[PDB]
Structures are given as structure tokens and as C-alpha cells.
């Protein structure tokens, strides 16, 4: 029942820099701690076992250290292949293995503002009695963003689905889609439809809008 905590969920770094991820055991695991790299497509590789030993074929810029309860993985000179999620695992007693919750490793880049597009429901969806308003916010950085929906000057979160891509391997940007799901009647109740983004690239809200009555 040994608990592993990786306290950092996510961290940003630039290409070339030195990155350290920490793992804290709730008791002494006597160096039986391993590090795994999981890619967004789900591939898992072992990097380092028994605290500091490199798995065959693993680049020498990964290293590990620790003892007792405190362990860490360091990547010297970060490369874009190293963007990934990193997990620790204690293996002192089979089958009582435990894993830490993972630490996402993100690549840093210049701030980039989102290209926003808003989409009324198609008359085809309305015909069937549904009404989903969609907003896309593409190729932005950083990841932190606060999209909300305003309808006739009332903020709405109920029925709102937000979905984010992974960091893009070609421009290191993020994207997201926010969808407001309503019944046709709920949709018709109101007229003014606003997808409002709060992002550090703008002093004021980046907004996209339409009126139902057209």
C-alpha cells in the first residue's frame, strides 16, 4: 500500500534546458523505483530502473537519483522527443507495485493568440430538435485559457463541453473546442450568442458572437 506522489502534474521547459521530476514514496523503497515515459499515442517505454540504471537504448541525457523516500528523474538538454508524460513506479514487493500519477512535460514557446471561430447550429440539427453552438479556439499558447458562453448577458456553463488537443508536435500550440449543447427551445429563448475567451495574449476578452434572428 505504499503511496507514490509526483506533486508536479505539469511543467514547461524550453529545448536544451535541464528538467527535474520528483517522486515521493510514503515509506523507504530501498531504491526500487523506476521511471516510465508515456507518449500521447500511448506507447510506454522504461527509461530507468533501480533508481539510476538506464534501460538499453535509452539516451544518456535521462538520469535518476534518490534513496529512502525521495527520488527524481532529470533530463539534461531537453529535445522535442522528450515531450511526454513521465511516471514513477515502486517495485519493492510484488504484487504491491504502485505508480505515481504522472508528470506531463510540455515544450515552451512564444505566446500565441487563439484563432476563434463560432458556429450556429445547422438547420439540420434544429430540424431534429437539437441545438449545439460550437466555438473553436485554435493554435494558441499558453495552454491556460478561460472560455465562457454569454447568452443575452447571462454567463452559461451548464451543457458546456470543452475539449483540448495535446500540444502540437509542429508548432507546439494548443487548440480547443467548446460546445454549448441546448434544446431547440432553450436555443430559441435567446438571441445573442457569445463565445468569450480570456487569454494572456489580449488585455481584454477575445469574443466571437452572433444573433439568432440573424
Amino acid at each position: 500500500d505504499i503511496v507514490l506522489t509526483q506533486s508536479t502534474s505539469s511543467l514547461s521547459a524550453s529545448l536544451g534546458d535541464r528538467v527535474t521530476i520528483t517522486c515521493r514514496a510514503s515509506q523507504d523503497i530501498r531504491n526500487y523505483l523506476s521511471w516510465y515515459q508515456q507518449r500521447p499515442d500511448g506507447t510506454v517505454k522504461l527509461l530507468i530502473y533501480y533508481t539510476s540504471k538506464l534501460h538499453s537504448g535509452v539516451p544518456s541525457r535521462f538520469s535518476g537519483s534518490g534513496s529512502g523516500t525521495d527520488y527524481s528523474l532529470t533530463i539534461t538538454n531537453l529535445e522535442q522527443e522528450d515531450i511526454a508524460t513521465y511516471f514513477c513506479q515502486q517495485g519493492k514487493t510484488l504484487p504491491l507495485y504502485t505508480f505515481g500519477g504522472g508528470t506531463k512535460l510540455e515544450i515552451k514557446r512564444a505566446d500565441a493568440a487563439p484563432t476563434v471561430s463560432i458556429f450556429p447550429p445547422s438547420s439540420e440539427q434544429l430540424t431534429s430538435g437539437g441545438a449545439s453552438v460550437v466555438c473553436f479556439l485554435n493554435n494558441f499558447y499558453p495552454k491556460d485559457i478561460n472560455v465562457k458562453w454569454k447568452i443575452d448577458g447571462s454567463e452559461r456553463q451548464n451543457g458546456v463541453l470543452n475539449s483540448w488537443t495535446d500540444q502540437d508536435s509542429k508548432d507546439s500550440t494548443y487548440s480547443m473546442s467548446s460546445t454549448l449543447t441546448l434544446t431547440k427551445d432553450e436555443y430559441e429563448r435567446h438571441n445573442s450568442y457569445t463565445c468569450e475567451a480570456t487569454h494572456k495574449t489580449s488585455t481584454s476578452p477575445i469574443v466571437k458572437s452572433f444573433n439568432r434572428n440573424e
Binding site: Y32, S34, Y36, G42, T43, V44, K45, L46, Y49, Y50, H55, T85, F87, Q89, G91, K92, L94, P95, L96, Y97, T98, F99, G101, G102, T115, S117, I118, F119, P120, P121, S122, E124, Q125, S128, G130, S132, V134, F136, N138, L161, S163, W164, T165, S175, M176, S177, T179, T181, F210, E214
Partner: protein
């Protein structure tokens, strides 16, 4: 090789059974401990089960003991996981792994397969409703234009969106699916030059292999 390839995953009803298989190659199978690890959709990893070289000892963490059975075949280089009275919570990606130890202790997992997806649910298989997303009016028409395809109310995962552009080029964002009122919704976007659309026909085609369905929807400017 070393190589591990899982199979047998899919959709099973609540309280159902399933057997996964994993074929190993590239090493002397019978010399190694093996295990099954699973990763929930919330991305937490956990050991489901482990087995020694000859298969005489099996090892289950109190979580799994025993709705799961791990077994192996050292003649056929195969590892199995059998599961019964499955619950919603057993929805996860299941990885086959080779264990590695020193002379005293088995402590790490040095090779992993790609994983097999397992979905445990009562909900009926449902093809998606696919709605084209064209900009409502009017402008800004903008330098490039973004079109979309909302894919809603389907089950299980996944779907595939294919954009027919048709000899233009354009890159695509695919947004991961989310649950809503029992079913999955996802969306996909495509960006094209503005002088390119609506002059050129754009269509999003959505396949849902579990229903064996395909629909093509034209992106209507009107």
C-alpha cells in the same frame, strides 16, 4: 522484438467476461515474469496481475483478487488475462508487460505492448449524428476559414473523421471525445484558404466501426 502484442479488447456489457491475449516475441519467454497493467481513462496506471516464469505462482493486488485470472503458455509464447463480472470501472487500456528483476526480487517492467482498449458498459451501440459546421453570418471572412464537423451521440469509441477537401490541403484538428447524456460527442475542424471555400466542395466523412456505419456530410455555406 522484444515485442509484445495484445488482442481481444473491445466492448463488453456490465457483468460480462473477456479474455485478452498477448503474443511475445524476441526473447526467451519462459525465463520471465509477466504482468498485466491497466491505465484508466483518467490516466492512472495500476498493476492488475503478475505471473512467475513457469506459471506456478500468480500475484493479484487486493483490487483484482480474483475477478481476474492471469495465465501463460510457455510453448506458444502467450500471456492471457481472463476477466469476469466486469464493472464500468474496469474500462481502461490493458497493457501486457514483461517483468524484470535481480537475483532477489522482481521490481520493474522493462517492455510494454501497445495496449488493448476495453469498454465495459450497458449502453447500446449507437452510430453518431454528424452535423457540418459552417460559419454563421456574416464576416469576418478572414485570411483562412475554419470549417467543422460535430459528431454527437455515439457509442462506443471511437470514430474516424476524414476530410475530403479534395485536392486542396488543409490541416485538421481532432478534438478528443467527451461523455454527455450517456454517449460520446467529439468534433473535428479543418482550415482552408478563404478563396478556396465555398468555391470548393468540402465534406466530412465519419466512420464508426462498432456500428459499421459511414456518413458523408457536405459543409453547406447556407
Amino acid at each position: 522484438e522484444v515485442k509484445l502484442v495484445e488482442s481481444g479488447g473491445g466492448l463488453v456489457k456490465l457483468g460480462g467476461s473477456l479474455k485478452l491475449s498477448c503474443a511475445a516475441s524476441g526473447f526467451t519467454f519462459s525465463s520471465y515474469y509477466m504482468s498485466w497493467v491497466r491505465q484508466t481513462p483518467e490516466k492512472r496506471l495500476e498493476l492488475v496481475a503478475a505471473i512467475n516464469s513457469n506459471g506456478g505462482n500468480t500475484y493479484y493486488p487486493d483490487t483484482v483478487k480474483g475477478l481476474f485470472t492471469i495465465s501463460r503458455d510457455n510453448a506458444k509464447n502467450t500471456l492471457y488475462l481472463q476477466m469476469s463480472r466486469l464493472k464500468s470501472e474496469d474500462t481502461a487500456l490493458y497493457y501486457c508487460t514483461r517483468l524484470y528483476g535481480n537475483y532477489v526480487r522482481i521490481h520493474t517492467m522493462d517492455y510494454w505492448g501497445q495496449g488493448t482498449s476495453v469498454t465495459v458498459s450497458s449502453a447500446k451501440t449507437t452510430p453518431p449524428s454528424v452535423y457540418p459546421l459552417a460559419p454563421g453570418c456574416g464576416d469576418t471572412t478572414g485570411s483562412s476559414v475554419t470549417l467543422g464537423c460535430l459528431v454527437k451521440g455515439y457509442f462506443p469509441e471511437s470514430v474516424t473523421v476524414t476530410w475530403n477537401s479534395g485536392s486542396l490541403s488543409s490541416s485538421v484538428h481532432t478534438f478528443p471525445a467527451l461523455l454527455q447524456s450517456g454517449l460520446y460527442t467529439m468534433s473535428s475542424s479543418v482550415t482552408v484558404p478563404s478563396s478556396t471555400w465555398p468555391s470548393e466542395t468540402v465534406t466530412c466523412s465519419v466512420a464508426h466501426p462498432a456500428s459499421s456505419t459511414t456518413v458523408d456530410k457536405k459543409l453547406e455555406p447556407s
